[PDB]
Every structure is written in C-alpha cells, then in structure tokens.
C-alpha cells in the first residue's frame, strides 16, 4: 500500500521502506534497516509506505535534524501521522524551552540518584531469576527473564501491581509494534483509562513511588495538572515496559551465538562497560522522527512544512562513516559512536537505569551460566516498529556447566 508521491518529491529520492515490515526481516532487524545505507540509497529518501515520509539514513543527518528543533519538531514524532498526532506524551511531544521543565521533573523520578538507590534490588532480582533458571537447562529468555527483570523493577519503582503487567505490556506492544488489533488512539486511551484513577489517588494520598512524585510535582512554579501527569506517566510506562526488555533479547541472542564474546567478558570483566556501549551501538532499536515546522531546505532536499521525517536513532551507529565494520561487534573499539538513547534535547533520562540493568544482567548471567546456546531448530524472529523486538528466544544449556553463587 503505497501513497501517491506528493509534488515536491523528486522521484529519484523514492525508496519504499516499510518501517513496520522491512524486507530483509529474516536476516535480522538491524540488518533489514541497514539496507537504507547501501550505495544505491541517497542520504535522504522518501517512502510511500505508512502514508509518505522522509527518512534520513546517515548519522550526520540524524544528529543535525535532532539538534535542530526549530525546523524539526517533536509535536508529531511518530509515523504514521495519526499515531504521531494521537500521542501527547511529555516531554517527548514538546520542544525547548517548554520541554525543559517537564524533563527536570522526569529526571527526579528516573535519574542517577534513583538508580544508585535501587541498585541492590536490581542485583537482587537478577541473581534470583538467573539462579531460578540455571538448573532447568532451558528458558524462553524473552518471557523468562527479559520481560520480568526490567518490568518488575519498574513496577516497584512506580508502585504498581505485578498483576497489571500482562495488561499494560499488551497496550505498550500496541504502540511500538502495532498489531492491527487496535489503532494508536484506542491504545493510548486504554493506557490512559488505567492511569487516571491512579493519579487521582496519588494526588490525594501521596506515596514515594514515581507516579506520586510526578503527580505532585512543580513545573514552572505552579503545580502540574492531572492531564500533564497522565501524559508523563504514559511515557514512563512504555519506556519502562518496552525497551530494556527488547534490548536484552537482541543482546542475549548475540551472546548465545558468540562463545568468544562470552569468554572475553568472563576473563576481562573490566570490559563489561565497554561491551555494553558496543551492544547498544549494534543492537540499537528505536526509530522515531520529527515534523517540519516550515518549508526548509535540508542537505539540498526541499522539505515542505508538515512533512514528517523518520530519524532512525538505530541508524547512526550502524553507519560506516561513523563506525568501521558496523555489523561487527568489537569490544575494544577506540570509539563507539551511536545515538541509541537519542540526540539533542530529548536525550533519554532513563539511560542510567537501562545501562545498570544491562551490566547487571551480563555480569550475573555469565557468572552462573557461562556457556549456552540457542535451541537447535528454533528460528528467531525479530519484529520492526518504533521499537523493534525479538518474538521469542529459546536458550538451552547443560546444567552441569553452570555455577551456583
Ligand atoms: C535500552 C533502552 C532504551 C533506549 C534505547 C531508549 C531510547 C530513547 C530515545 C531514542 C529517546 C528519545 C526519543 C525522541 O527523541 O523522540 C528516549 C527518550 C526518553 N526515554 Fe528512553 N530509552 C530506553 C529506556 C528507557 C527507560 C528504561 C526509561 C525510564 C522509564 C526511559 C525514559 C525516557 C524518557 C523519560 C524520555 C524522554 C526524554 C525527553 O523527552 O526529554 N527510557 N529514550
Ligand atoms: C514510544 C514511546 C516511548 C519510547 C521510549 C523512550 N524511552 C524509551 N522508550 C519509545 C517509543
């Protein structure tokens, strides 16, 4: 389903990429997207899928568009338009300087200090889940660890019931990797039907959880409104539920195939941090974009006010002009260039949480289960969308090679 090419688009800039269903999906998600960086594809292309939009395919362009909020606005950050239109998440749907007050608050809830505080639970939960897995010789990493780990830590943080996971997780999946079962607005509304009664309660009777801190916070000297709180909380949910979850599966899938990488980390633990950056570069997974605020000429292409452009954060680090041998995971790269957690004013506030969770998972898993692989005859499937994922990850191992700690 291709939308008719608008007038201002040179037919030579057409490249019909479906961000919801790239062509080389079988090969892997990052590999499927990276077709945008072949010699045949211009730096800035137009796809007729998902109703027509620009895509910047290079690190240099993505970074620039990101920095440039004057021209490229977050007002409508999602493709398709209706999805970007229906989204009113804060601070994500706002530009500086408005953005800034809301961000400062969100930072209170997720920043460094909170991670430092939660660190012992993070470690506790990872050890406990792993130890629980170990003797079995087999899981579903996606369901058995990558889902529970990051999620139970978020629920804890936000003061929400474990019982709500199944429910929330579905709604969140609908937003980043729309199924067709429900539109974006419906998905947004139901998540919202959820939070509303909750924020009500925490404005009345405050706790120490994130929702309470958000719901009772100050923004530009006055108190945040219920609607504003609803809107920040929405973002927190998706970030909390949907990101690290998918990140871990790509990473683990990689580790399950690369014994030598496992070993390197086992013998030279001082490398964990450096490896974490490299996996963040290679298994980058977020693709969103911006809306043009006017007619503007970018890198020789004429953009019309109201044109949406996808600025795949995933693509910067997979670019050869930024990283030599981009598809190759190398723990000792002198410089790991990426924009995994974004660029410009919208840099991810929850990056600290995310890294802490990755490093723990690697350090702890490898410790107990140093030798593992993918189940013989399992075919791993990735999924594409705003945030990409792994469908299932069946792992197998000999319990006899594990070590209980
Ligand atoms: C490994 C996982 C993660 C990745 C790759 C990721 C990536 C991103 C990206 C690319 C952006 C900017 C989007 C834009 O510019 O449109 C962003 C923003 C955001 N992220 Fe993350 N994120 C992750 C995890 C998290 C977590 C765990 C949280 C906290 C619950 C979170 C909270 C946020 C917030 C609050 C913003 C908005 C910042 C602003 O608008 O000022 N993220 N993230
Ligand atoms: C949709 C909404 C939120 C996000 C996100 C921000 N940080 C992590 N995930 C990604 C897509």
PDB file of N, CA and C in Angstrom, residues 207-268:
ATOM      1  N   UNK A 207       2.449   8.870  47.882  1.00  0.00           N
ATOM      2  CA  UNK A 207       3.460   7.900  48.315  1.00  0.00           C
ATOM      3  C   UNK A 207       4.842   8.459  47.889  1.00  0.00           C
ATOM      4  N   UNK A 208       5.756   7.513  47.801  1.00  0.00           N
ATOM      5  CA  UNK A 208       7.155   7.695  47.478  1.00  0.00           C
ATOM      6  C   UNK A 208       7.478   7.171  46.076  1.00  0.00           C
ATOM      7  N   UNK A 209       6.510   6.528  45.457  1.00  0.00           N
ATOM      8  CA  UNK A 209       6.684   5.936  44.111  1.00  0.00           C
ATOM      9  C   UNK A 209       6.839   7.065  43.087  1.00  0.00           C
ATOM     10  N   UNK A 210       7.120   6.642  41.847  1.00  0.00           N
ATOM     11  CA  UNK A 210       7.376   7.637  40.787  1.00  0.00           C
ATOM     12  C   UNK A 210       6.117   8.418  40.430  1.00  0.00           C
ATOM     13  N   UNK A 211       5.005   7.714  40.385  1.00  0.00           N
ATOM     14  CA  UNK A 211       3.724   8.318  39.995  1.00  0.00           C
ATOM     15  C   UNK A 211       3.339   9.424  40.954  1.00  0.00           C
ATOM     16  N   UNK A 212       3.514   9.188  42.245  1.00  0.00           N
ATOM     17  CA  UNK A 212       3.304  10.136  43.338  1.00  0.00           C
ATOM     18  C   UNK A 212       4.253  11.308  43.150  1.00  0.00           C
ATOM     19  N   UNK A 213       5.520  11.027  42.866  1.00  0.00           N
ATOM     20  CA  UNK A 213       6.446  12.198  42.692  1.00  0.00           C
ATOM     21  C   UNK A 213       5.992  13.039  41.483  1.00  0.00           C
ATOM     22  N   UNK A 214       5.569  12.356  40.417  1.00  0.00           N
ATOM     23  CA  UNK A 214       5.159  13.061  39.196  1.00  0.00           C
ATOM     24  C   UNK A 214       3.880  13.863  39.445  1.00  0.00           C
ATOM     25  N   UNK A 215       2.859  13.225  39.917  1.00  0.00           N
ATOM     26  CA  UNK A 215       1.534  13.733  40.183  1.00  0.00           C
ATOM     27  C   UNK A 215       1.481  14.923  41.118  1.00  0.00           C
ATOM     28  N   UNK A 216       2.461  15.053  41.979  1.00  0.00           N
ATOM     29  CA  UNK A 216       2.563  16.137  42.971  1.00  0.00           C
ATOM     30  C   UNK A 216       3.723  17.079  42.696  1.00  0.00           C
ATOM     31  N   UNK A 217       4.244  17.120  41.485  1.00  0.00           N
ATOM     32  CA  UNK A 217       5.468  17.858  41.130  1.00  0.00           C
ATOM     33  C   UNK A 217       5.164  19.288  40.733  1.00  0.00           C
ATOM     34  N   UNK A 218       6.197  20.076  40.667  1.00  0.00           N
ATOM     35  CA  UNK A 218       6.180  21.501  40.293  1.00  0.00           C
ATOM     36  C   UNK A 218       6.831  21.674  38.919  1.00  0.00           C
ATOM     37  N   UNK A 219       6.204  22.464  38.105  1.00  0.00           N
ATOM     38  CA  UNK A 219       6.680  22.788  36.754  1.00  0.00           C
ATOM     39  C   UNK A 219       6.387  24.254  36.446  1.00  0.00           C
ATOM     40  N   UNK A 220       7.470  25.006  36.439  1.00  0.00           N
ATOM     41  CA  UNK A 220       7.390  26.460  36.152  1.00  0.00           C
ATOM     42  C   UNK A 220       6.544  27.138  37.238  1.00  0.00           C
ATOM     43  N   UNK A 221       7.012  26.954  38.472  1.00  0.00           N
ATOM     44  CA  UNK A 221       6.498  27.453  39.706  1.00  0.00           C
ATOM     45  C   UNK A 221       5.157  26.976  40.196  1.00  0.00           C
ATOM     46  N   UNK A 222       4.314  26.562  39.283  1.00  0.00           N
ATOM     47  CA  UNK A 222       2.956  26.055  39.566  1.00  0.00           C
ATOM     48  C   UNK A 222       2.995  24.538  39.560  1.00  0.00           C
ATOM     49  N   UNK A 223       1.908  23.959  40.016  1.00  0.00           N
ATOM     50  CA  UNK A 223       1.724  22.509  40.114  1.00  0.00           C
ATOM     51  C   UNK A 223       1.276  21.940  38.762  1.00  0.00           C
ATOM     52  N   UNK A 224       1.823  20.772  38.492  1.00  0.00           N
ATOM     53  CA  UNK A 224       1.499  20.039  37.247  1.00  0.00           C
ATOM     54  C   UNK A 224       0.013  19.728  37.252  1.00  0.00           C
ATOM     55  N   UNK A 225      -0.614  19.666  36.122  1.00  0.00           N
ATOM     56  CA  UNK A 225      -2.045  19.320  36.066  1.00  0.00           C
ATOM     57  C   UNK A 225      -2.103  17.801  36.013  1.00  0.00           C
ATOM     58  N   UNK A 226      -3.296  17.317  36.195  1.00  0.00           N
ATOM     59  CA  UNK A 226      -3.602  15.873  36.158  1.00  0.00           C
ATOM     60  C   UNK A 226      -3.285  15.359  34.763  1.00  0.00           C
ATOM     61  N   UNK A 227      -3.667  16.170  33.789  1.00  0.00           N
ATOM     62  CA  UNK A 227      -3.514  15.803  32.345  1.00  0.00           C
ATOM     63  C   UNK A 227      -2.032  15.676  31.988  1.00  0.00           C
ATOM     64  N   UNK A 228      -1.227  16.628  32.450  1.00  0.00           N
ATOM     65  CA  UNK A 228       0.218  16.642  32.282  1.00  0.00           C
ATOM     66  C   UNK A 228       0.901  15.424  32.942  1.00  0.00           C
ATOM     67  N   UNK A 229       0.351  15.084  34.122  1.00  0.00           N
ATOM     68  CA  UNK A 229       0.898  13.941  34.886  1.00  0.00           C
ATOM     69  C   UNK A 229       0.567  12.639  34.145  1.00  0.00           C
ATOM     70  N   UNK A 230      -0.651  12.646  33.624  1.00  0.00           N
ATOM     71  CA  UNK A 230      -1.157  11.443  32.906  1.00  0.00           C
ATOM     72  C   UNK A 230      -0.166  11.151  31.778  1.00  0.00           C
ATOM     73  N   UNK A 231       0.056  12.191  30.990  1.00  0.00           N
ATOM     74  CA  UNK A 231       0.964  12.305  29.889  1.00  0.00           C
ATOM     75  C   UNK A 231       2.403  12.027  30.172  1.00  0.00           C
ATOM     76  N   UNK A 232       3.019  12.377  31.283  1.00  0.00           N
ATOM     77  CA  UNK A 232       4.373  11.962  31.569  1.00  0.00           C
ATOM     78  C   UNK A 232       4.308  10.438  31.910  1.00  0.00           C
ATOM     79  N   UNK A 233       3.364  10.136  32.792  1.00  0.00           N
ATOM     80  CA  UNK A 233       3.302   8.718  33.210  1.00  0.00           C
ATOM     81  C   UNK A 233       3.187   7.788  32.046  1.00  0.00           C
ATOM     82  N   UNK A 234       2.478   8.227  31.007  1.00  0.00           N
ATOM     83  CA  UNK A 234       2.314   7.356  29.815  1.00  0.00           C
ATOM     84  C   UNK A 234       3.703   6.998  29.246  1.00  0.00           C
ATOM     85  N   UNK A 235       4.563   7.981  29.152  1.00  0.00           N
ATOM     86  CA  UNK A 235       5.880   7.767  28.573  1.00  0.00           C
ATOM     87  C   UNK A 235       6.751   6.817  29.380  1.00  0.00           C
ATOM     88  N   UNK A 236       6.623   7.036  30.704  1.00  0.00           N
ATOM     89  CA  UNK A 236       7.375   6.246  31.680  1.00  0.00           C
ATOM     90  C   UNK A 236       7.015   4.767  31.531  1.00  0.00           C
ATOM     91  N   UNK A 237       5.742   4.520  31.327  1.00  0.00           N
ATOM     92  CA  UNK A 237       5.246   3.164  31.189  1.00  0.00           C
ATOM     93  C   UNK A 237       5.861   2.399  30.031  1.00  0.00           C
ATOM     94  N   UNK A 238       5.787   2.940  28.859  1.00  0.00           N
ATOM     95  CA  UNK A 238       6.310   2.428  27.595  1.00  0.00           C
ATOM     96  C   UNK A 238       7.817   2.289  27.714  1.00  0.00           C
ATOM     97  N   UNK A 239       8.505   3.293  28.196  1.00  0.00           N
ATOM     98  CA  UNK A 239       9.971   3.218  28.346  1.00  0.00           C
ATOM     99  C   UNK A 239      10.282   2.067  29.282  1.00  0.00           C
ATOM    100  N   UNK A 240       9.570   2.026  30.413  1.00  0.00           N
ATOM    101  CA  UNK A 240       9.795   1.010  31.440  1.00  0.00           C
ATOM    102  C   UNK A 240       9.465  -0.377  30.950  1.00  0.00           C
ATOM    103  N   UNK A 241       8.335  -0.555  30.302  1.00  0.00           N
ATOM    104  CA  UNK A 241       7.862  -1.824  29.845  1.00  0.00           C
ATOM    105  C   UNK A 241       8.423  -2.424  28.587  1.00  0.00           C
ATOM    106  N   UNK A 242       8.712  -1.600  27.603  1.00  0.00           N
ATOM    107  CA  UNK A 242       9.063  -1.911  26.245  1.00  0.00           C
ATOM    108  C   UNK A 242      10.471  -1.806  25.800  1.00  0.00           C
ATOM    109  N   UNK A 243      11.452  -1.231  26.405  1.00  0.00           N
ATOM    110  CA  UNK A 243      12.768  -1.039  25.867  1.00  0.00           C
ATOM    111  C   UNK A 243      13.910  -1.933  26.205  1.00  0.00           C
ATOM    112  N   UNK A 244      14.223  -1.988  27.466  1.00  0.00           N
ATOM    113  CA  UNK A 244      15.302  -2.839  28.018  1.00  0.00           C
ATOM    114  C   UNK A 244      14.886  -4.272  27.703  1.00  0.00           C
ATOM    115  N   UNK A 245      13.602  -4.429  27.724  1.00  0.00           N
ATOM    116  CA  UNK A 245      13.001  -5.791  27.514  1.00  0.00           C
ATOM    117  C   UNK A 245      13.475  -6.386  26.188  1.00  0.00           C
ATOM    118  N   UNK A 246      13.320  -5.586  25.149  1.00  0.00           N
ATOM    119  CA  UNK A 246      13.758  -5.894  23.761  1.00  0.00           C
ATOM    120  C   UNK A 246      15.264  -5.795  23.643  1.00  0.00           C
ATOM    121  N   UNK A 247      15.862  -4.771  24.223  1.00  0.00           N
ATOM    122  CA  UNK A 247      17.316  -4.689  24.209  1.00  0.00           C
ATOM    123  C   UNK A 247      18.025  -5.958  24.654  1.00  0.00           C
ATOM    124  N   UNK A 248      17.636  -6.595  25.740  1.00  0.00           N
ATOM    125  CA  UNK A 248      18.251  -7.755  26.354  1.00  0.00           C
ATOM    126  C   UNK A 248      18.153  -8.972  25.456  1.00  0.00           C
ATOM    127  N   UNK A 249      17.000  -9.114  24.829  1.00  0.00           N
ATOM    128  CA  UNK A 249      16.816 -10.252  23.906  1.00  0.00           C
ATOM    129  C   UNK A 249      17.781 -10.177  22.729  1.00  0.00           C
ATOM    130  N   UNK A 250      17.940  -9.003  22.109  1.00  0.00           N
ATOM    131  CA  UNK A 250      18.892  -8.913  20.963  1.00  0.00           C
ATOM    132  C   UNK A 250      20.275  -9.260  21.472  1.00  0.00           C
ATOM    133  N   UNK A 251      20.608  -8.755  22.632  1.00  0.00           N
ATOM    134  CA  UNK A 251      21.975  -8.898  23.200  1.00  0.00           C
ATOM    135  C   UNK A 251      22.273 -10.353  23.553  1.00  0.00           C
ATOM    136  N   UNK A 252      21.266 -10.962  24.146  1.00  0.00           N
ATOM    137  CA  UNK A 252      21.422 -12.345  24.617  1.00  0.00           C
ATOM    138  C   UNK A 252      21.520 -13.319  23.468  1.00  0.00           C
ATOM    139  N   UNK A 253      20.682 -13.017  22.461  1.00  0.00           N
ATOM    140  CA  UNK A 253      20.692 -13.778  21.198  1.00  0.00           C
ATOM    141  C   UNK A 253      22.088 -13.707  20.593  1.00  0.00           C
ATOM    142  N   UNK A 254      22.679 -12.524  20.613  1.00  0.00           N
ATOM    143  CA  UNK A 254      24.049 -12.341  20.156  1.00  0.00           C
ATOM    144  C   UNK A 254      24.988 -13.174  20.988  1.00  0.00           C
ATOM    145  N   UNK A 255      24.837 -13.116  22.337  1.00  0.00           N
ATOM    146  CA  UNK A 255      25.777 -13.839  23.190  1.00  0.00           C
ATOM    147  C   UNK A 255      25.673 -15.336  23.034  1.00  0.00           C
ATOM    148  N   UNK A 256      24.499 -15.883  22.890  1.00  0.00           N
ATOM    149  CA  UNK A 256      24.210 -17.269  22.666  1.00  0.00           C
ATOM    150  C   UNK A 256      24.897 -17.778  21.392  1.00  0.00           C
ATOM    151  N   UNK A 257      25.150 -16.924  20.442  1.00  0.00           N
ATOM    152  CA  UNK A 257      25.854 -17.312  19.183  1.00  0.00           C
ATOM    153  C   UNK A 257      27.305 -17.055  19.188  1.00  0.00           C
ATOM    154  N   UNK A 258      27.865 -16.386  20.130  1.00  0.00           N
ATOM    155  CA  UNK A 258      29.286 -15.950  20.043  1.00  0.00           C
ATOM    156  C   UNK A 258      30.081 -16.251  21.275  1.00  0.00           C
ATOM    157  N   UNK A 259      30.512 -17.511  21.393  1.00  0.00           N
ATOM    158  CA  UNK A 259      31.266 -18.019  22.520  1.00  0.00           C
ATOM    159  C   UNK A 259      32.433 -17.185  22.928  1.00  0.00           C
ATOM    160  N   UNK A 260      33.173 -16.722  21.917  1.00  0.00           N
ATOM    161  CA  UNK A 260      34.365 -15.916  22.110  1.00  0.00           C
ATOM    162  C   UNK A 260      34.043 -14.597  22.797  1.00  0.00           C
ATOM    163  N   UNK A 261      32.872 -14.077  22.551  1.00  0.00           N
ATOM    164  CA  UNK A 261      32.468 -12.804  23.176  1.00  0.00           C
ATOM    165  C   UNK A 261      32.134 -13.024  24.652  1.00  0.00           C
ATOM    166  N   UNK A 262      31.486 -14.146  24.873  1.00  0.00           N
ATOM    167  CA  UNK A 262      31.182 -14.598  26.231  1.00  0.00           C
ATOM    168  C   UNK A 262      32.462 -14.711  27.057  1.00  0.00           C
ATOM    169  N   UNK A 263      33.480 -15.374  26.535  1.00  0.00           N
ATOM    170  CA  UNK A 263      34.730 -15.594  27.163  1.00  0.00           C
ATOM    171  C   UNK A 263      35.481 -14.329  27.506  1.00  0.00           C
ATOM    172  N   UNK A 264      35.482 -13.437  26.587  1.00  0.00           N
ATOM    173  CA  UNK A 264      36.215 -12.173  26.712  1.00  0.00           C
ATOM    174  C   UNK A 264      35.788 -11.439  27.962  1.00  0.00           C
ATOM    175  N   UNK A 265      34.508 -11.439  28.191  1.00  0.00           N
ATOM    176  CA  UNK A 265      33.787 -10.768  29.254  1.00  0.00           C
ATOM    177  C   UNK A 265      33.995 -11.499  30.596  1.00  0.00           C
ATOM    178  N   UNK A 266      34.107 -12.794  30.495  1.00  0.00           N
ATOM    179  CA  UNK A 266      34.364 -13.677  31.616  1.00  0.00           C
ATOM    180  C   UNK A 266      35.761 -13.491  32.178  1.00  0.00           C
ATOM    181  N   UNK A 267      36.779 -13.413  31.365  1.00  0.00           N
ATOM    182  CA  UNK A 267      38.126 -13.178  31.733  1.00  0.00           C
ATOM    183  C   UNK A 267      38.563 -11.769  32.008  1.00  0.00           C
ATOM    184  N   UNK A 268      37.931 -10.826  31.375  1.00  0.00           N
ATOM    185  CA  UNK A 268      38.363  -9.390  31.491  1.00  0.00           C
ATOM    186  C   UNK A 268      37.096  -8.591  31.754  1.00  0.00           C
TER     187      UNK A 268
END
